[PDB]
Design a protein around this ligand. Structure first.
Ligand code: 132
Lengths: 248, 110
């Protein structure tokens, strides 16, 4: 996250780090104690040996000795992710559930029919680079960015027609604050009180962009509301699965 | 802005908005309660229902609702949204569904 600040313990209790052979590669969001929602592009051919993946949770410092690290039982990715950028979403089933404490909590999904409010300012968190030719963050960072409309983002001055309908952009026309390498798979959350209680919901998954924090090249997120049914299905369908499976 | 389907934080009873009344109605208990509790939790943005039970208007009260809604069980398994398979009804038994959905999106610090 470029242009963000260090956050503290328990503020974004759903954030997890996905590490492969020791290195933090992507971010993820806990949907329950045993399921994490991330991006399909985090599991390319060379990173598909589940035994080499760990999910770190409950800490904001990557080197905290007080966070938990569990294994992965299975990864269910979206069969429509042609690269294997639309349908850049995947579910990770942990080998055992995480306890839910004041530092490990699941995030909510958008309600049925709940749509994105262009202009609304949401938060994006992660441990990715704080500068494109920079290093990852040692402490989880958080930043606030508004949703940009598709008419603006698909303009020839932004991403000239590359933003397909199940993705959206968030950021400042000016650049300055954005997600970057290492934040992929992580959470883009907005808070609302439609359930009469304020709750944070996962509206996007950090997916891609051109460089980081440049003006007119905002970040692109997977729009979670359009995958609600895929997620409900996948979880029922593959609860007892092991391996890399794909669901469309 | 309120979402048409709500669940009580006092006794988890489900309430569905009746736009012709501007009131919330309870969901009459049926043999499909588990599917209805699961579908109501998904609808609202929760991942699943952990459990559900049956309350009795006579021992629990109405808590400001006006009537009941019943679910067309035969159509229930074709649905994605609850509001398309529900109808006002009399619910003679006076027993409704309560659903405990997985909690989410809230910080638990002091
Ligand atoms: N500026 C942005 N809006 C942005 C930039 C990047 C850059 C990346 C990224 C770059 C190189 C490699 C990976 C990667 C590849 C495989 C596994 C894990 C990460 C990235 O996610 N992801 C990004 C996501 C976003 Cl919104």
């Amino acid at each position: 996250i470029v242009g963000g600040r260090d956050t503290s313990l328990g503020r974004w209790p759903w954030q997890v780090s996905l590490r492969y052979d020791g290195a933090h590669l992507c971010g993820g969001s806990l949907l329950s104690g045993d399921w994490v929602l991330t991006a399909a592009h985090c599991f390319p051919e060379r990173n598909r040996v589940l035994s080499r993946w760990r999910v770190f949770a409950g800490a904001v410092a990557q080197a905290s000795p007080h966070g938990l690290q569990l294994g992965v039982q299975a990864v269910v990715y979206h069969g429509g992710y042609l690269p294997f950028n639309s349908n850049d979403i995947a579910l990770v089933h942990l080998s055992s559930p995480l306890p839910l404490t004041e530092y490990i909590q699941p995030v909510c999904l958008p309600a049925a029919g709940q749509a994105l409010v262009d202009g609304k300012i949401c938060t994006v968190t992660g441990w990715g680079n704080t500068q494109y030719y920079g290093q990852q963050a040692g402490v989880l960072q958080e930043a606030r960015v508004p949703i940009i409309s598709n008419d603006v983002c698909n303009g020839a001055d932004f991403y000239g027609n590359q933003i397909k309908p199940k993705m959206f952009c968030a950021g400042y026309p000016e650049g300055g604050i954005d997600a970057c390498q290492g934040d992929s798979g992580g959470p883009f959350v907005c808070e609302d009180s439609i359930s009469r209680t304020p709750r944070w919901r996962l509206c996007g998954i950090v997916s891609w962009g051109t460089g980081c924090a440049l003006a007119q090249k905002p970040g692109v997120y997977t729009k979670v509301s359009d995958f609600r049914e895929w997620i409900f299905q996948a979880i029922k369908t593959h609860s007892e699965a092991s391996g890399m499976v794909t669901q469309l | 802005p309120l979402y048409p389907v709500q669940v009580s934080s006092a006794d988890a009873r489900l309430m569905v908005f009746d736009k012709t009344e501007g009131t919330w109605r309870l969901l009459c208990s049926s043999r499909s309660n588990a599917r209805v509790a699961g579908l109501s939790c998904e609808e609202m943005g929760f991942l699943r229902a952990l459990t559900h039970s049956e309350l009795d208007v006579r021992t629990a009260g109405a808590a400001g609702t006006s009537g009941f809604f019943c679910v067309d069980e035969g159509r229930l398994p074709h649905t994605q949204r609850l509001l398309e398979v529900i109808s006002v009804c009399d619910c003679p038994r006076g027993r409704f569904l309560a659903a405990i959905c997985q909690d989410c999106g809230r910080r638990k610090l002091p």
